[PDB]
Design a binder for this molecule. Sequence first.
Ligand SMILES: [Mg+2]
Ligand SMILES: [Mg+2]
Ligand SMILES: [Mg+2]
Ligand SMILES: [Mg+2]
Ligand SMILES: [Mg+2]
Ligand SMILES: [Mg+2]
Ligand SMILES: [Mg+2]
Ligand SMILES: [Mg+2]
Ligand SMILES: [Mg+2]
Ligand SMILES: [Mg+2]
Ligand SMILES: [Mg+2]
Ligand SMILES: [Mg+2]
Ligand SMILES: [Mg+2]
Ligand SMILES: [Mg+2]
Ligand SMILES: [Mg+2]
Ligand SMILES: [Mg+2]
Ligand SMILES: [Mg+2]
Ligand SMILES: [Mg+2]
Ligand SMILES: [Mg+2]
Ligand SMILES: [Mg+2]
Ligand SMILES: [Mg+2]
Ligand SMILES: [Mg+2]
Ligand SMILES: [Mg+2]
Ligand SMILES: [Mg+2]
Ligand SMILES: [Mg+2]
Ligand SMILES: [Mg+2]
Ligand SMILES: [Mg+2]
Ligand SMILES: [Mg+2]
Ligand SMILES: [Mg+2]
Ligand SMILES: [Mg+2]
Ligand SMILES: [Mg+2]
Ligand SMILES: [Mg+2]
Ligand SMILES: [Mg+2]
Ligand SMILES: [Mg+2]
Ligand SMILES: [Mg+2]
Ligand SMILES: [Mg+2]
Ligand SMILES: [Mg+2]
Ligand SMILES: [Mg+2]
Ligand SMILES: [Mg+2]
Ligand SMILES: [Mg+2]
Ligand SMILES: [Mg+2]
Ligand SMILES: [Mg+2]
Ligand SMILES: [Mg+2]
Ligand SMILES: [Mg+2]
Ligand SMILES: [Mg+2]
Ligand SMILES: [Mg+2]
Ligand SMILES: [Zn+2]
Lengths: 59, 136, 49, 79, 126
Amino acid sequence: AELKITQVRSTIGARWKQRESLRTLGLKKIRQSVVREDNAQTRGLINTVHHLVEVEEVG
Amino acid sequence: MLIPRKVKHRKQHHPEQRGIASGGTSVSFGDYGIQALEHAYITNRQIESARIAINRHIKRGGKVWINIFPDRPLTKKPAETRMGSGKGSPEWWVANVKPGRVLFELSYPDEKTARDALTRAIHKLPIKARIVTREE
Amino acid sequence: DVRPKITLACEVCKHRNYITKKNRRNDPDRLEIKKFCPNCGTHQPHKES
Amino acid sequence: SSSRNGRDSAAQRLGVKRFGGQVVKAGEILVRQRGTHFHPGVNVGRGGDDTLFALAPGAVEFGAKRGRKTVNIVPVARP
Amino acid sequence: AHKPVGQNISEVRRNARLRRHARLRKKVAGTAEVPRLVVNRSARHIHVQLVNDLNGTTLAAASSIEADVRAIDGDKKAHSVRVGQLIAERAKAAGVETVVFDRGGYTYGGRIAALADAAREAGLKF
RNA sequence: UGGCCGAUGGGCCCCACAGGGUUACUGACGUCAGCCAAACUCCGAAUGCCGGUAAGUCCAAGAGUGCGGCAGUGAGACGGCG
RNA sequence: AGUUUAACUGGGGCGGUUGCCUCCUAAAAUGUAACGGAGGCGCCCAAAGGUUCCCUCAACCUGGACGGCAAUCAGGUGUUGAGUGUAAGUGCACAAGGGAGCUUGACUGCGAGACGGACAUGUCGAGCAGGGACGAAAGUCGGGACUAGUGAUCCGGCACCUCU
RNA sequence: GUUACGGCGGUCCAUAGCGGCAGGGAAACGCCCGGUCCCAUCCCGAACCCGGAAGCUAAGCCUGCCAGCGCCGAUGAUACUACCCAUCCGGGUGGAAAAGUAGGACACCGCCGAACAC
Ligand SMILES: [Mg+2]
Ligand SMILES: [Mg+2]
Ligand SMILES: [Mg+2]
Ligand SMILES: [Mg+2]
Ligand SMILES: [Mg+2]
Ligand SMILES: [Mg+2]
Ligand SMILES: [Mg+2]
Ligand SMILES: [Mg+2]
Ligand SMILES: [Mg+2]
Ligand SMILES: [Mg+2]
Ligand SMILES: [Mg+2]
Ligand SMILES: [Mg+2]
Ligand SMILES: [Mg+2]
Ligand SMILES: [Mg+2]
Ligand SMILES: [Mg+2]
Ligand SMILES: [Mg+2]
Ligand SMILES: [Mg+2]
Ligand SMILES: [Mg+2]
Ligand SMILES: [Mg+2]
Ligand SMILES: [Mg+2]
Ligand SMILES: [Mg+2]
Ligand SMILES: [Mg+2]
Ligand SMILES: [Mg+2]
Ligand SMILES: [Mg+2]
Ligand SMILES: [Mg+2]
Ligand SMILES: [Mg+2]
Ligand SMILES: [Mg+2]
Ligand SMILES: [Mg+2]
Ligand SMILES: [Mg+2]
Ligand SMILES: [Mg+2]
Ligand SMILES: [Mg+2]
Ligand SMILES: [Mg+2]
Ligand SMILES: [Mg+2]
Ligand SMILES: [Mg+2]
Ligand SMILES: [Mg+2]
Ligand SMILES: [Mg+2]
Ligand SMILES: [Mg+2]
Ligand SMILES: [Mg+2]
Ligand SMILES: [Mg+2]
Ligand SMILES: [Mg+2]
Ligand SMILES: [Mg+2]
Ligand SMILES: [Mg+2]
Ligand SMILES: [Mg+2]
Ligand SMILES: [Mg+2]
Ligand SMILES: [Mg+2]
Ligand SMILES: [Mg+2]
Ligand SMILES: [Zn+2]
């Protein structure tokens, strides 16, 4: 499987741990499209940063 | 003029009032009672005044209760002293109250007179309140 | 002085090896103890001074 | 008006210092408890000041037995 | 009609026996190579077990109950000496030589001392 | 805070060494129930932290730790949270 | 004549404090201020140390008389509600609580590794060599149940040495 | 193999404790009989220790039964809270208590050693 992740809100003024998790995801600038594996761990990542990202599911 | 007659220490920190009043949330003892609405302080003077208002009108029949008791002290630094230099001295005692608490409890024959007395008690109280009966 | 200051010496040695404090008011008799001091290499009672 | 309070102590920084399942080496301290909040177990030493440590490499393991708290070290298998 | 208004001597006695054995048991860390030798004495018999606390399982034991040892008309010093010799030789057969002794809650002296000695000069070094 | 037997206020109208607050008191204990506590906890989390494993950003953050040259700063403010 | 005459401070001054220890504030790792809330320390100890052994209360009903509400008691529910050198917290009945016997480990030189420290320091610690202590032995013994009872450097005094 | 037996043991040590009731002496267990010799009473053979088994299981122990009390404990809800929010004002997802409630419940199990049977 695969996931399309795109940050929809800026990182500014967000909890430091959330910012670091965003870096882990690998989104530098707002509205970047990134493809990632559908693991439980990345699912948890998206769940945590859900208020900043939208998920489009591919495959 | 209710006051604890001895405690471990004569002063206490500021309060947290957040939270719904759980203790005594339902009338039990008599057959009628008040129930407050909003968080607030209640001074010993206020409690005593309400007790007088209830009692003197009810006169002979029935007997009252007071589910609360002002315990926590308070202080206010006298005027003309730049703030600092330690805690002030205690002035009055207050009993906390949370939404839904029952303040007074009555067992008198007639609902009308019970309501009337408790209404005067409400008017003399500092925070909103309303009648409530024993029923489920 | 509430708690005087006492030294202890070996016999063959005579070396101020151990020092300890006492209440002279309640102990007017001199202190005796069996202990060790290194150089003569074996235990031996130490005296007061 | 004057205050008679306002003095305090130092901060000894007590508390458990190697947590359950960690890997500790010989002579390693485990806890610093004023009272006997815990109790020694096999391969644990009772310090001069109610402190707990380990007398052999291994992984620390807490556990309740007889309704108390006692620390112990399981020697991790030699690779 | 019986109404208890106090405590009981024998009950507190058994509790105290367990208590006092507890001090030593606390320390004892006796493995297969160094099992703990437990001694129990009755008003009529003596019992001894050699166990490794690691598994809480015994290795060898004997007591005044066995018919051959009861065949000894003597008293409990002699009974204890014979039983201790049996423990020693059974432990030797099983292949254990160095062990630790448990005071079994009783104070040393008399029958316990006789058992200890018998075990000592029977070849059981502990 | 309000109730219950309450002998015995652990005690009183005559003190008999013996009947009643024959008298409204006190009534201890305990028990029925209803609150309160930063220095009370027979209870007890989401969080935070430390330890182990695994995936990911791995044309590098420009990630960490140590050592070495360099100065600043040790007058904070506000807002949200306790 | 050359100089000294503190800081903290909700402006200064007068008051009070200046180090150390306990708890709370402290947001369940540590830590975390205030002239915030509350209390103590500048010791004691040849035993109140070590070890071996014995044993465990207080609460409880009754009183040959003093003697009583309480002095000592035993019968026979008895689980710390009593206590544990000096405050509080943490612990403590498997005792850290008493008694006794003995006796000095309140040893000597080191110290695997750690804890805390901005730094100087401060804390814990299994094992190794001599000797000793208690216990037949197993083992425990490097000060007190722990956490306060403290002072750097210089200058000087005193003893021993296979230093010059 | 059974046992209405004794020691040692276990266990996020009370579902395992306490209370009342009934029953056990073949062996073992207790109580028990007496203190020359061991040993002890800060006096006492009360404790311990020692010699013996005349007696009895009342006490204690054990087992069985009782829900009187302790005790464990749902689902559900409520309190609480991580993160985010909308011009305060409380909701969205995640986490999910305490107490109370139906209920459960008068321990289970390991190794050896004793009486009946093989
Ligand atoms: Mg508040
Ligand atoms: Mg608060
Ligand atoms: Mg009002
Ligand atoms: Mg010296
Ligand atoms: Mg502190
Ligand atoms: Mg209630
Ligand atoms: Mg609290
Ligand atoms: Mg606590
Ligand atoms: Mg925290
Ligand atoms: Mg980890
Ligand atoms: Mg780069
Ligand atoms: Mg550099
Ligand atoms: Mg520079
Ligand atoms: Mg500065
Ligand atoms: Mg500054
Ligand atoms: Mg500043
Ligand atoms: Mg600041
Ligand atoms: Mg400001
Ligand atoms: Mg802020
Ligand atoms: Mg000049
Ligand atoms: Mg100034
Ligand atoms: Mg000012
Ligand atoms: Mg001024
Ligand atoms: Mg903390
Ligand atoms: Mg600061
Ligand atoms: Mg003082
Ligand atoms: Mg001693
Ligand atoms: Mg008695
Ligand atoms: Mg002691
Ligand atoms: Mg004692
Ligand atoms: Mg080293
Ligand atoms: Mg040696
Ligand atoms: Mg040592
Ligand atoms: Mg010491
Ligand atoms: Mg010590
Ligand atoms: Mg100088
Ligand atoms: Mg028989
Ligand atoms: Mg006798
Ligand atoms: Mg019976
Ligand atoms: Mg009995
Ligand atoms: Mg319970
Ligand atoms: Mg039960
Ligand atoms: Mg559920
Ligand atoms: Mg937000
Ligand atoms: Mg709003
Ligand atoms: Mg629950
Ligand atoms: Zn010498």
